[PDB]
Structure formats: structure tokens, C-alpha cells
């Protein structure tokens, strides 16, 4: 149940941290239509985090989505390094989003057959949403990469700038594996074929190039984060930290 708790928390944290990032976009997009789309995606993702976190708290026998989100520090947080990357420009947001959406699809499509009933329900919900996300993110990838001269380049650098963090997507530890052998979790390594088949194609149809640099950055799952996470949390948790243990 301890092992299960950490995995569930990981998925929540992935969703939570990314949700946070999208929040910064509110009202700053090139079009009202994008603002709407980004707020919609942020909202969807936040719902999933609550779902994951609420279950993790029930599994741990204490706390709730709020204690978990607001009373942990950056060394306890277990999100992928990718979702904590800064928003940068719209391509950077899109690139980050596309990689995540593609991963979520591969994961949640498969994680909905979990022998764990709560994971299955959470996963059944998330997949329908993730499908929308991928359509939007891939959509924008194609629009930017096969857009103007300038957006094609920005899309390549954005892809380039995020690639190294892709390694973490298929990194497996003893939690993944043990839970995978009980038929409960998905072994991230087996997500590689689908992500690559989607993403390479997605990169391909948009007319862009896959980096040849071997991706090498991991650590988010172990609580070993970039220098980005810390400031994100300071902002996110402030009010709870000043006025702990209250109802809002």
C-alpha cells in the first residue's frame, strides 16, 4: 500500500505541477481561443491531480489532496522534471505539452486495465481528457512546425530544449516494477514504443527533426528536482503556509 501510494502520488504530482504552469498562461495567450483551451487543459489536469492525490491520502490513512499539495516540500514532491519546466514561449509550452499528452495517452490507455479498481476509474476519466489534450498539442505542433519560417525554428529549439528530460518518461524503479508484476502499474519502459511511434510521427508530420542527443535527465520521481520546482512551490503554498490547518 506504501508502494502504491508513491506511484499514485507521482501521477498526481505530474498533473499538479503542470496544471500550475498552465495557470501562468491565463490571459496571456495569442488568442482568446488559446486562453480558453489552456485554461481548459489546466482544469482537466487539476481534476486528475485531486483524483490521484485524494486516493493517495486515503491509501496513507491520513491527510487529503490539500495536505499533500500544500505541506510537502520540493524534496518530497515526485513529479516528472518535464512538467516543472518553465512556460517559455508558446512553442515551449506546446512542446512540453505534446510530450506529456502523448505519454498520458500511452499510460492511461493502459493504466485503465489496472487490477486496482480506483486506478482504473481515475484512468477511465483521464484518458477521455488526455485525448483532447493531445489533439490540441499535436495540432499546434503541426501549425507551428509547418507554419512560418520563424515558428518552425522556434518549434525545433523548443523540442531541442526539452528533449533531455524525456528520458524520465521511461525510467523504471522498484515501485513501478513491483506494482507492474502485481499487474497494477504500467512499467514506463514499455511505454517507449507508443510514445516514440506517436511523437516521432507527430514530429514528422509537422516537418521537424528528432534530436540525436540521447536524453539523460531523471530524478523528479526520487525528489531530485531542477532549481525550477522550489520557486513554483513557494508561490503555490504561500497562503497555506501562512495560515495552516484552515478551511477555504
Amino acid at each position: 500500500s506504501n508502494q502504491l501510494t508513491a506511484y499514485t502520488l507521482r501521477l498526481g504530482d505530474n498533473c499538479l505541477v503542470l496544471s500550475q504552469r498552465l495557470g501562468e498562461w491565463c490571459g496571456h495567450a495569442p488568442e482568446l481561443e488559446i486562453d480558453l483551451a489552456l485554461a481548459n487543459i489546466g482544469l482537466d489536469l487539476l481534476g486528475q491531480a485531486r483524483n490521484f492525490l485524494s486516493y493517495a491520502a486515503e491509501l496513507a490513512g491520513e491527510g487529503d489532496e490539500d495536505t499533500l499539495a500544500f505541506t510537502r516540500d520540493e524534496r518530497q514532491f515526485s513529479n516528472l522534471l518535464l512538467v516543472e519546466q518553465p512556460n517559455g514561449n508558446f512553442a515551449d509550452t506546446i512542446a512540453r505539452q505534446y510530450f506529456i499528452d502523448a505519454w498520458h495517452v500511452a499510460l492511461f490507455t493502459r493504466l485503465m486495465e489496472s487490477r486496482d479498481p480506483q486506478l482504473a476509474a481515475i484512468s477511465a476519466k483521464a484518458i477521455k481528457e488526455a485525448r483532447y489534450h493531445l489533439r490540441f498539442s499535436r495540432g499546434w505542433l503541426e501549425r507551428l512546425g509547418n507554419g512560418t519560417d520563424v515558428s518552425g525554428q522556434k518549434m525545433q529549439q523548443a523540442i531541442n530544449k526539452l528533449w533531455r528530460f524525456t528520458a524520465e518518461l521511461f525510467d523504471a524503479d522498484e515501485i513501478d516494477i513491483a506494482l507492474s508484476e502485481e499487474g497494477i502499474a504500467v512499467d514506463p519502459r514499455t511505454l517507449r514504443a507508443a510514445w516514440e511511434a506517436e511523437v516521432f510521427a507527430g514530429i514528422n508530420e509537422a516537418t521537424l527533426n528528432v534530436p540525436q542527443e540521447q536524453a539523460y535527465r531523471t530524478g523528479g520521481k526520487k525528489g531530485l528536482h531542477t532549481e525550477h520546482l522550489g520557486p513554483m512551490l513557494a508561490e503555490m503554498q504561500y497562503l497555506q503556509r501562512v495560515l495552516p490547518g484552515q478551511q477555504w
Binding site: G23, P30, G47, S151, M236, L243, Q246, W248
Partner: protein, 304 residues
């Protein structure tokens, strides 16, 4: 003498026959519907920034989700209103530029800063409270498309106002510190909320034609009074105060009597010299300009 075109129109307004996009209308009426609706749509857009300011800092996941939803709805509302204005022959893109240039207005209330979480709950409760009164009043506006947008919008928005109120109730039933927080937000947003209804009945140049043309169904002062009457008991429910020493009930009329609005402040605000005017427009200017390359990419792909 009015012309025959002018006379038929007056008869249609009087008889409450909805005006539709293909019906004839006076250029000043067209322009005034374009004027008012266009600024209504802008207000939905600018209102995203103050509310959006607290998304990353919202104290619980639930309130954060509600806030996200609320900001999502505002974008959608901008879209309906822009669609509606376009029926009058104007362009979404052009009126937006005028907005960005300061040649069109947006609601005075969004030039005020969000300095606490309570501000978020107060906006949801009071500011939306004021919007609803005005907007429900416009559900019988003489121009069909506008009236239909208001109907569509009020159905959804009253829910969110309620949620905004519930966040306020939480602070009111919460810690001492939370209570103090709420009161301050109220103290900062009360008069600005009253100013959302517009100038006095004797300082309102657009009112003369609009009432006559049944665009505006109730006078600014009339709408303001209804809101005050409705909202004071909600303030009471929260165990809160209103920052108005002159507020008192008048049994003779059945209404609440309240102090004079600071009209000098209001005039400062509408000419671009309020607290956040510059920041709001800069943010919007920055979004548009830095977004140029995305739209140009988008256009070139569309063409392919």
C-alpha cells in the same frame, strides 16, 4: 418629421418586437449597440487578469479549480459577445485594437488589484453580483442577439457567483485572520462594485437615447439601488460591514439609503488613471504583440 424608416423602427421598439441582424436600424443605434456590447465583451477579457493573478496561489485545490472554471467561462462569454457585436457589421479584431489603444473602454472594476485571496471571493460574490443585476436587466434589451447572449450568460454565471459567495462564507466562518481578510476585500471592492452600474441619471450622456430606444431598460441609479437592496442582507449573512457611514435603511421608501459615490475617482478610472489600468493594457498589449508570430504561423498553415 421623422422619415418612414424612422417611424416603423420606433413602432417596432415600442411593441417589443426583437431587432434582428437583417432589420434596418439607425446608424447611431447600430453604433451605440456596437459601443456597448463591444465594451461588454472587453470587460470579460480584462477581467481574466485580476482573477487569473490568484490561480497559482489559490489556497485549496477545490477553490483553485472553481477559479479556473470561472476564468474559463469569462473567455467563453467574451466569445458570445464578440459574435453578437459582429452581427452589427463590426470586426472583432478592429474593436480589440481600439480597446488596446484605449479608444474603447472596459469595466472600471478590472483596474483594481487583487491583493488577497479574499479579493477573489469578493469579486465572485460582489462584482459578479453587480454584473448579474445589470445583465439580467438586459435579458429584455431591444436588440435580439444581445438579449439572447444575456439569457445564455446569466444561466451559467449565477452558479459561479454562488460559489464565489461560498468561498466568502468560509472566510466568514473561519479564523479571525480569515475574517479580517474578507472585510478588507469588501472595504476595497464595495464602492468600485457600485460604480459598475455607471454614472448618475443626470450625468449619463448615452442614457437619453438608450432608454428611449429600450436598450437600457432600467436607469443606472435604478440598477444600483436594486443591487444594494439585494446585497446588504448578503453582507449581513457574512457578519461583515459595508464601508459606508451613510448607509441606513429608509422604511418610508422600503429601500436602503447610501452615501455619495466618489465620482472624481470614477472619472480618473475611465480615462486610464486608476490603479491597474496601465498594467492591464500592457499585459494585453504584450499578449497580442508577443503572440503575433503564433497567429502568422497559424494563418500560413491554414492556407496550406
Amino acid at each position: 418629421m421623422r422619415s418612414t424608416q424612422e417611424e416603423r423602427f420606433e413602432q417596432r421598439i415600442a411593441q417589443e418586437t426583437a431587432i434582428e441582424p437583417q432589420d434596418w436600424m439607425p446608424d447611431a443605434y447600430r453604433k451605440t449597440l456596437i459601443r456597448q456590447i463591444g465594451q461588454h465583451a472587453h470587460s470579460e477579457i480584462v477581467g481574466m487578469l485580476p482573477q487569473g493573478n490568484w490561480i497559482t496561489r489559490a489556497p485549496t485545490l477545490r477553490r483553485k479549480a472553481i477559479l479556473l472554471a470561472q476564468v474559463q467561462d469569462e473567455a467563453g462569454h467574451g466569445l458570445y459577445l464578440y459574435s453578437a457585436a459582429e452581427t452589427l457589421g463590426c470586426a472583432r479584431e478592429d474593436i480589440y485594437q481600439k480597446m488596446l489603444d484605449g479608444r474603447m473602454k472596459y469595466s472600471s472594476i478590472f483596474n483594481y488589484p487583487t491583493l488577497s485571496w479574499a479579493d477573489i471571493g469578493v469579486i465572485g460574490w460582489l462584482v459578479d453580483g453587480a454584473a448579474i443585476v445589470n445583465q439580467v436587466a438586459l435579458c429584455r434589451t431591444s436588440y435580439g442577439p444581445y438579449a439572447r447572449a444575456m439569457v445564455k450568460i446569466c444561466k451559467e454565471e449565477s452558479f459561479h457567483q454562488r460559489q464565489g459567495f461560498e468561498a466568502c462564507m468560509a472566510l466568514a466562518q473561519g479564523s479571525e485572520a480569515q475574517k479580517q481578510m474578507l472585510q478588507d476585500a469588501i472595504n476595497r471592492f464595495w464602492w468600485p462594485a457600485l460604480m459598475m452600474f455607471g454614472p448618475n441619471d443626470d450625468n449619463s450622456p448615452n442614457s437619453a437615447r438608450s432608454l428611449t430606444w429600450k436598450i437600457k431598460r432600467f436607469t443606472n441609479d435604478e440598477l444600483r439601488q436594486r443591487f444594494v437592496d439585494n446585497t446588504v442582507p448578503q453582507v449581513e449573512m457574512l457578519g461583515m460591514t459595508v464601508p459606508d457611514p451613510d448607509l441606513h435603511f429608509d422604511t418610508e421608501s422600503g429601500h436602503y439609503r447610501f452615501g455619495e459615490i466618489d465620482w472624481q475617482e470614477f472619472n480618473e478610472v475611465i480615462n486610464g488613471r486608476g490603479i491597474c489600468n496601465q498594467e492591464r493594457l500592457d499585459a494585453k498589449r504584450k499578449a497580442w504583440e508577443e503572440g503575433t508570430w503564433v497567429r502568422e504561423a497559424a494563418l500560413a498553415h491554414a492556407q496550406k
